[PDB]
Amino acid sequence: PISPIETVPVKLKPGMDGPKVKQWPLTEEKIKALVEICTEMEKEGKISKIGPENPYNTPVFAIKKKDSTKWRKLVDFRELNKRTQDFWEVQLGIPHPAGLKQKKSVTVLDVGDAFYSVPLDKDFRKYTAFTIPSINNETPGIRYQYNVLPMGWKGSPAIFQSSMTKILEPFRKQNPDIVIYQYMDDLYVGSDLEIGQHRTKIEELRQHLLRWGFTTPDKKHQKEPPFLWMGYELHPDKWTVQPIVLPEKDSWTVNDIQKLVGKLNWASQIYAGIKVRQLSKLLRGTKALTEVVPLTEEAELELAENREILKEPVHGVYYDPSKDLIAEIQKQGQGQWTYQIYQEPFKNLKTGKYARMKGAHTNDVKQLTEAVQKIATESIVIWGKTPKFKLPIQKETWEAWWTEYWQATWIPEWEFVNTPPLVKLWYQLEKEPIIGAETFYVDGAANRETKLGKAGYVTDRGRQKVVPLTDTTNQKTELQAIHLALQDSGLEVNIVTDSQYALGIIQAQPDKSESELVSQIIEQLIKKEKVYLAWVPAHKGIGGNEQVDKLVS
Amino acid sequence: IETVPVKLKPGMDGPKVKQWPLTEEKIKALVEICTEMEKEGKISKIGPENPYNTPVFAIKKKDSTKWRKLVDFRELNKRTQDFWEVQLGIPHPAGLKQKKSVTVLDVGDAYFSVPLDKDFRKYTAFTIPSINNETPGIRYQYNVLPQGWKGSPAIFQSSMTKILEPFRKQNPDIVIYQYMDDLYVGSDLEIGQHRTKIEELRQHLLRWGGYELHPDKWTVQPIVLPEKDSWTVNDIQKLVGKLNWASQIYAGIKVRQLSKLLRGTKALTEVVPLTEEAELELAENREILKEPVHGVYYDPSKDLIAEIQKQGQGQWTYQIYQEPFKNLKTGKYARMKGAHTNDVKQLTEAVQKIATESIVIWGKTPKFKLPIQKETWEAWWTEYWQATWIPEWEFVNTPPLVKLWY
DNA sequence: TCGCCCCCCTTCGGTGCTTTGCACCGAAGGGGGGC
Ligand SMILES: C=C1[C@H](COP(=O)(O)OP(=O)(O)OP(=O)(O)O)[C@@H](O)C[C@@H]1n1cnc2c(=O)nc(N)[nH]c21
Ligand SMILES: [Mg+2]
């Protein structure tokens, strides 16, 4: 049926008109698929025939539905969508099974012909003009316009969701103890009533939907576990992800690896310890989706580890609001982090991973903080609260960090958990100069016009050095000057630079970097025993800096 | 009542800002508040054919344990027409900062009695989220002058003046300055008798429909220099790099005498005796740092900017300026919550205190340059916000080259 | 040969700095998943 609900008024963008795009050829199996849908759609009032006075058109096609025999009619409204007004989408996110509470009785329902049950704004219908080709050459196609929401229009999802929300609102207010997860036209309905009382409320809900023109066919009415919902299987005490089939290839293309990595990210929500760094590395610097990419040895190893994880059965549990949320993080190496969220030990609600490289230079403490923030945001979305954290970082390490680092930083209530490898600071800079340590006055300069530069130093003990540099920058030569002081100095060293830039990077105590040169400096800082690093303004002729500035010229 | 026709600025469209995730108790507070506002007609439920949105959240002050809805209309305010071009702006009184006690009152509810231009209401849309996305977001728009919109104090201007006139008449030495939804009420009265007059003003406004600040006690903290008996090569490099920086702010600052004390390639820990000339040069520079800078004046036509540096042990320095190195004010904020161990809470409260001082002194908040990662700030800052206004801010990563302001 | 939503990983290009490259960040490409 067509809902008697009021239509939502919609407009074209100012100054714009409607689409005028011709229909492409289609197979006879799809033409009769469309003629069957459209003849029946016109009978039910979903579409109406139009004539030449309507100058618009848009192409139509059809794909098959997951229910194998049914076809789904689609219209390539890309031209109309560009000229249609913007909407504020009310779908803010995706419900997760870990956010569900245990319920005595559960039902899953789906609305039949959902979009076609919602009427379209009368003044807007003329812009949805289309045509069914019918063996293209034999005759000109028959023209229609939509009277209901078309599949492929930019506004259809939001206008449907808004209508579904209005239709459900009376039932929600009358039954606050009945949880209705509403995703598009899919309805999860859980309650703590006995199965007979529960089925009574479902009948009531289904009858309410039908009065507003939303059918609920028995074929999509799930009554007993396991319920298929949002790509998961809902059991009474647990939930599983629907089976994940990884691509299996002798020769891999760029697009194959993209699919594989996406599958693994999806799996990482419940499969602990998934890693995709080495597989994703293969995508860098590639130029075509069909380009054959050979798996590196590290990528084969990572893939094998993921396959072993995926062959073991896993399940998540449901949320108990009377207990604490606990999030535990482990370090995996190369900027990769995995986490588990649970309430009782060894019964995960869900898992996940964090592996984004943010910034050119960072350290494990920063990235652990980012993982904490991703988990905090995810927990607010799913459960409406922040979990308690168990983190592989000593309280001393963290306390060292947020007192030396110049930016405000914080982690909520957290408990140290000894799961090596631990997160640590890989070096620290002395707050005072080091007695008996050599004093290096460093400096580097590059000629911007050319590619050339020099890096060198002078020391309190009389040591001096200059290294010519090619294809460099002003900022690279200064890092090079520091690079050389660390190279030629003992385990304790005092260094004085005039590069605020270089001082800025090193003072943040990075342990990894997209830069090969900064990585070398990091490796040298880690080997040192004590390092004091100081700054002076350039070209003001101060002590050792003037003489090293003299030297590099 | 007749509405005032309101427009956006030419060539500007309304805000389209996403709603961020909210905790369970903030969502429930907003649902309760918006349901009540909807019955009373202050807001109306809307659909998605309205393409605008503004984030909403909720705060709860510790000395008022009821939730307060907070709509972040900063984007809508930047796009709204100016009322200084349509002659409806508020003058800042110079005497508010002269008072010994300033109490902040939330008078936002007074706006809900004046309807809003029917054609402007679509720009005020907001969306309440849902725990675990059980439902789509629920959208509302305003039918009356919204709290937090800069057009509300301008449109309500004539009304609020008629409401306050009897009180300001009876208490001529009390100064009241309206900033957005707040009244800043200052006096030189004894503190227990200041609160008594605040209660009288509270009662007088209810006839229609915070904690005490002390500008008396806000002090400037200038650039200080270390004092020692003996000085190293490192101390004089730290000293000269600092004065060299400060010569961008102050006039006639010299580093030749001290600078030369450092000739040759010397060890950092070597002790160098101060020559009498250099000692004179030092105490010379210490005096210029002591008394304030000549030729720096507030310009009301330019924005205010605030920089903040984390110094450690709960200390936070800050500078307010409009043009670089011409600081209208330098200060130091000190935490006192009791625990000592939350940087983000301290920075958020430092932002509220600095912005509060700018309202009292100049009548508006500065654009902040926050020494924090954007994602660290956005993960936590709403947990500590207590003001009905929100200032503009941006995020900077600036290592301390010199411990300048400490 | 379509639509709307969330996620991750890679790439690209605009912004502003007392710069001449660099770091930051939002947007868009690819992928996963939902209806
Ligand atoms: C969520 C949606 C509604 C309910 O999705 P649905 O899968 O339950 O389909 P519907 O109720 O119509 O038929 P049903 O009677 O068999 O249940 C459908 O109307 C439309 C929409 N949707 C779904 N998939 C697609 C798609 O790929 N392309 C487009 N443009 N829109 C799509
Ligand atoms: Mg359906």
Residue numbers in the entry:
A (entry chain A): 1 to 553
B (entry chain B): 5 to 213, 231 to 427
Quote the paper:
Fortunately, the RT/RH domains of HBV Pol exhibit weak sequence homology with human immunodeficiency virus type-1 (HIV-1) RT. In particular, a consensus sequence present across multiple regions (i.e., Motifs A, B, C and D) that creates a dNTP-binding site (N-site) for HBV/HIV-1 RT is significantly conserved. We therefore newly generated HBV RT-mimicking HIV-1 RT mutants by substituting unconserved N-site residues with corresponding amino acids in the HBV RT sequence. Here, we report the acquisition of 3TC/ETV resistance using HIV-1 with three HBV-associated amino acid substitutions (F115Y/Y116F/Q151M) in the RT N-site.
Furthermore, we determined a series of crystal structures for HIV-1 RTF115Y/Y116F/Q151M:DNA in complex with 3TC-triphosphate (3TC-TP) and ETV-triphosphate (ETV-TP), and with their reference natural substrates dCTP and dGTP, respectively. We determined a total of four ternary complex structures for HIV-1 RT3MB, including RT3MB:DNA:3TC-TP, RT3MB:DNA:dCTP, RT3MB:DNA:ETV-TP, and RT3MB:DNA:dGTP, to a resolution of 2.51 Å, 2.56 Å, 2.32 Å and 2.30 Å, respectively. In addition, single Mg2+ bound at the N-site in a typical octahedral coordination with three oxygen atoms derived from the triphosphate moiety of NRTI/dNTP, two carboxylic oxygens of Asp110 and Asp185, and the main-chain carbonyl oxygen of Val111. Electron density for all Met184 side-chains analyzed in this study was well-defined, and structural superimposition revealed that the conformation of the Met184 side-chain could be classified into two conformational modes: a “normal conformation” located near the ribose ring of the bound dGTP/dCTP with appropriate van der Waals distances, and a “backward conformation” pushed backward by the exocyclic methylene/oxathiolane ring of ETV-TP/3TC-TP. The HIV-1 RT3MB:DNA:3TC-TP ternary complex revealed that the thioether moiety of 3TC-TP oxathiolane lies closer to the Met184 and ribose ring of the 3′-end nucleotide, and consequently the side-chain of the Met184 is moved backward, as in the conformation of Met184 observed in the RT3MB:DNA:ETV-TP complex. Based on the present structures, we suspect that substitution of Met184 with Val/Ile would cause steric clash between a Cγ atom of Val/Ile and the methylene/thioether of ETV/3TC, assuming the Cγ atoms of Val/Ile are positioned similarly to those in the two conformations of Met184. The structural superimposition of RT3MB/F160M/M184V and RT3MB also showed that both the methylene C44 of ETV-TP and the sulfur of 3TC-TP are located 2.8–3.0 Å from Cγ1 of Val184, indicating a severe steric clash. The present structure analyses suggest that the interactions of the Met184 side-chain with oxathiolane of 3TC-TP and methylene of ETV-TP are likely responsible for tight binding of 3TC-TP and ETV-TP at the N-site, respectively. Therefore, the branched chain of Val and Ile is expected to be incompatible with the binding of 3TC-TP and ETV-TP to the N-site.
